[PDB]
């Protein structure tokens, strides 16, 4: 089967761990240690292909290896965290430097869409993603809305690469 190496990046507290755990365990974690960085594996069928997703949940040699060998990146912010959205540029710049390219498979993810506090509008994020030439997808690690879409879209972006 085909392996896809995915890396989840973004500011502390945006839901990188929650998203990853939702994808694998179909459960929402309230209080996952903010310092645990690890890789997780999930066998899936995506568009009729048996895939192994090798996912690094960032929070170190392991990070360097995945940043270098990672095929695609979820850049996550939370829709109730303006700073995390503003920080996205830094994560994008980092990925471009480590890949020496501005054409890297990536999806911009606006997490916590279940919350009534939104301080980042969908259109602001759409605009940023358009500027980078990538998709924008909103998610909730709590309700599972958008979660498969975000990860599976990242796979469909790697396939175009
Ligand atoms: N309501 C809501 N809370 C979320 C969501 N995703 C994460 N959280 C909460 O946000 C906090 C940070 O999540 P975590 O996954 O640890 O963030 P990380 O630092 O990016 O790994 C925790 O209290 C989570 O329960 C979401 O989609 N909705
Ligand atoms: Mg975490």
Author numbering: 1 to 59, 65 to 166
Authors' account:
The three human oncogenes, HRas, NRas and KRas, encode highly related membrane-bound Ras protein isoforms that act as “molecular switches” cycling between GDP-bound and GTP-bound forms. The GTP-bound active form has a high affinity to downstream effector proteins, such as Raf, and triggers the mitogen-activated protein kinase (MAPK) pathway. This GTPase signalling is terminated by accelerated GTP hydrolysis catalysed by GTPase-activating proteins (GAPs). Tyrosine phosphorylation on Ras by Src kinase is known to uncouple Ras from upstream regulation and downstream communication.
To gain atomistic insight into how phosphorylation of Y64 could influence intrinsic GTP hydrolysis and nucleotide exchange rates with phosphorylated Ras, we initially assessed the stability of phosphorylated Ras. Our results indicated that mono-phosphorylated Ras remained stable in buffer for over a week, rendering it suitable for subsequent crystallisation trials. We first crystallised the apo RaspY64-GDP apo structure with commercial crystallisation screens. Thus, it cannot provide the accurate location and coordination of pY64. α2-Helix adopts a conformation that is highly similar to other GDP-bound product structures of Ras with an angle difference of <5° degree.
